[PDB]
């Protein structure tokens, strides 16, 4: 910025005007605009070289928003820390960035890439007989690691519990660690000969995700992000079948754990004898040399009280040195206690599978030193238009609160106000109308509700099965199977338990009456239930995702906030003020004021052995 006259409208751009630089003669072809200050990248997806950059940008920059035409990425330290791992140096990143940019890359951006791209590749953490050695390939590192204030060809031991400290410490100091596994040369660990049976059909994006992991030939530890229903289960299965070592799977549910074993058996040649499911029901472990364990965090992250039956199994898990860990729904591993499993369980390779990589707190970044960087990410609309996932017409219905209920909403406190605007009669009518309309269309509907009292009230009013946390594993499984194959039961009423990791290929429509505040992830996870609908390729098919919200209430504040992630992916919510043909339905719940008054008060009121014969 030298000898560059400002424009009369430059005031509207507060230090954001980037006209001080000039445009290159080949602007019409190059698709990228680069922000010299914020690091943002504007990508033209409708110009040549668009595809060549849509993958290069995903590696070095995390995606902010990827709408139809103009994509918006951003370069940050973590995104570079993700790209630095898979055989990428500063020169390649700078060369391509300049080659794809309509404007020259500013010095500030070049400085940022130079700083973080040189750290990778000088410290290696290895495991031997449940003993962790921080092995380094050069002697000079001893004067750095052994002299570090936090720490404590040359290789030295380190406490197993202390891994989570040194790995984070390595980030602050110049060299961060990488967890690479040369399973080809590992003979001490007994192998497991399992392979994908010929019937399998590895989809392109699945191959791309695996290539980003096995590109060099040694398995890299990291995270793979694919849209809901994209087939993350087969991605993990393929990784297990190519490493060919004892593997353990952690999944955050009992229904989901059952799903994994059935999927593992179906897609590859894993013999049933070598599979053991460690859930609350059965705790037997495989005694064969090499096998597979599919368990859950609650059954593996517990610290204080373990039963005798569950204590032998945990020792069995800890004693052996596993070769691969699959963390399904890895957005929950950085929690206060779940992260402990990543340290206790010994493994040379760690993989994370999650459709959503977001959490309300700042602990999302902790994944970097727990399991490694983010290897691959996939767009949602791209897979939608290719027939891999279903298309959904997202909608947001505005049920205006009736006069009678609304008056109480003003006086009542925050905690009870929630139950008040979840049970307004208009929502009952809208849900009843939509359910009848879509059932006539031969659709399988799911009605989510984080609030259990409303869930039961809706279910008993409409005579439909419902599932919530107190349900024994079998009964909810029986409900799930019936909903899938029984033609009479077209709809169910799920709760927070079914928010994630439950697969219903038949579900096509989706409704939600309650919500867990402002969480953006729950909306996406819930939408995932219908993104894998079986008939997602017949002409003109469109799944549905309704969101009933009371107007002039705090729910709209959370609704416009809990769909900020789907908008970034590309989904657009449509406002529905009124459902045509809703009045002519024969009978609607709470159509008379008497019933409305009764419901209002009902919800408002919610807040010596011989003496044995004597008795």
């Amino acid at each position: 910025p030298a000898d560059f006259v400002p424009d009369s409208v430059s005031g509207m751009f507060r230090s954001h005007d980037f006209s001080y630089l000039r445009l290159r003669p080949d602007h019409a072809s190059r698709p990228l605009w680069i922000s010299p200050s914020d690091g943002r990248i504007i990508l033209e997806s409708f110009s040549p070289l668009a595809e060549q950059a849509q993958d290069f940008l995903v590696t070095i920059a995390e995606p902010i928003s990827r709408p139809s035409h103009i994509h918006e990425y951003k370069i940050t330290a973590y995104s570079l820390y993700a790209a630095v791992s898979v055989g990428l140096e500063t020169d390649d990143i700078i060369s391509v960035l300049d080659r794809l940019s309509k404007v020259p890359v500013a010095e500030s951006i070049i400085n940022f890439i130079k700083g973080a791209t040189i750290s990778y590749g000088k410290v290696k953490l290895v495991i031997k007989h449940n003993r962790y050695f921080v092995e380094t390939t050069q002697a000079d590192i001893l004067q750095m690691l052994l002299n570090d204030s936090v720490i404590g060809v040359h290789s030295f031991e380190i406490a197993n519990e202390s891994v989570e400290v040194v790995k984070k410490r390595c980030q602050e100091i110049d060299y961060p660690v990488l967890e690479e596994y040369d399973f080809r040369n590992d003979h001490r660990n007994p192998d497991l000969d399992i392979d994908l049976k010929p019937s399998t059909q590895i989809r392109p994006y699945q191959e791309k995700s695996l290539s980003k992991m096995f590109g060099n030939g040694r398995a890299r530890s990291g995270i793979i992000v694919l849209p809901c229903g994209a087939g993350k289960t087969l991605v993990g299965i393929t990784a297990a079948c190519t490493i060919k070592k004892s593997v353990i799977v952690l999944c955050t549910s009992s229904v989901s754990v059952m799903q994994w074993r059935q999927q593992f058996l179906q897609w590859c040649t894993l013999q049933p004898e070598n599979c053991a499911v460690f859930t609350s029901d059965n705790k037997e472990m495989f005694q064969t040399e090499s096998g597979l364990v599919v368990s859950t965090y609650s059954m593996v992250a517990n610290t204080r009280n373990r039963s005798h039956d569950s204590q032998k199994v945990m020792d069995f898990l800890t004693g052996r040195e596993w070769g691969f860990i699959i963390l399904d729904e890895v957005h929950v591993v950085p929690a206060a206690m779940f992260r402990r499993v990543v340290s206790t369980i010994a493994a040379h390779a760690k993989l994370g599978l999650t459709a959503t990589l977001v959490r309300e707190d700042d602990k999302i970044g902790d994944l970097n030193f727990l399991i490694g960087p983010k290897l691959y990410e996939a767009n949602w609309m791209e897979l939608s238009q290719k027939g891999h996932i279903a298309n959904v017409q997202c909608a947001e219905v505005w049920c205006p609160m009736t006069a009678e209920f609304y008056q109480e909403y003003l006086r009542e406190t925050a905690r009870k106000r929630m139950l008040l605007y979840i049970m307004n009669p208009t929502k009952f009518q809208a849900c009843q109308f939509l359910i009848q309309y879509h059932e006539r269309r031969g659709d399988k509907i799911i009605v989510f509700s984080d609030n259990v009292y409303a869930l039961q009230e809706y279910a008993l009013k409409m005579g439909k099965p419902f599932i919530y946390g107190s349900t024994p594993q079998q009964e909810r499984m029986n409900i799930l199977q019936n909903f899938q194959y029984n033609d009479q039961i077209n709809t169910i009423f799920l709760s927070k338990v079914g928010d994630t990791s439950i697969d219903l290929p038949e579900a096509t429509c989706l409704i939600q009456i309650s919500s867990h505040y402002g969480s953006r992830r729950q909306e996406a996870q819930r939408l995932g239930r219908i993104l894998r609908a079986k008939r997602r390729n017949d002409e003109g098919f469109n799944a549905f995702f309704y969101s009933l919200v009371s107007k002039d209430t705090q729910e709209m504040y959370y609704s416009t906030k809990r769909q900020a992630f789907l908008v970034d992916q590309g989904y657009a919510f449509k406002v529905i003020t009124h459902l045509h043909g809703m009045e002519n339905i024969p009978n609607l719940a709470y159509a008379s004021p008497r019933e409305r008054r009764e419901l209002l008060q009902e919800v408002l009121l919610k807040n010596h052995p011989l003496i044995r014969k004597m008795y």
Partner: protein, 65 residues
């Protein structure tokens, strides 16, 4: 035969209840209740109830930074 100057407020139940709450806190707001969709309000408070109501409704709207 009696005229009374004022402002005729036409609105919906939700706005009506909010105006009543504002009137309860500040008495002079509402001069008379006409029907479930009409209120007679003090002329001086028209510019104040209109401005105050928007502030109250701002809580229900999520403005991102």
């Amino acid at each position: 035969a009696r005229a009374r100057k004022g402002a005729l407020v036409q609105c919906d139940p939700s706005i009506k209840a909010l105006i009543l709450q504002i009137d309860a806190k500040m008495s002079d707001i509402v001069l008379e209740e006409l029907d479930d969709t009409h209120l007679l309000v003090n002329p001086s408070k028209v510019e104040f109830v209109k401005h105050e109501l928007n502030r109250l409704l701002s809580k229900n709207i999520y403005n991102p930074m």
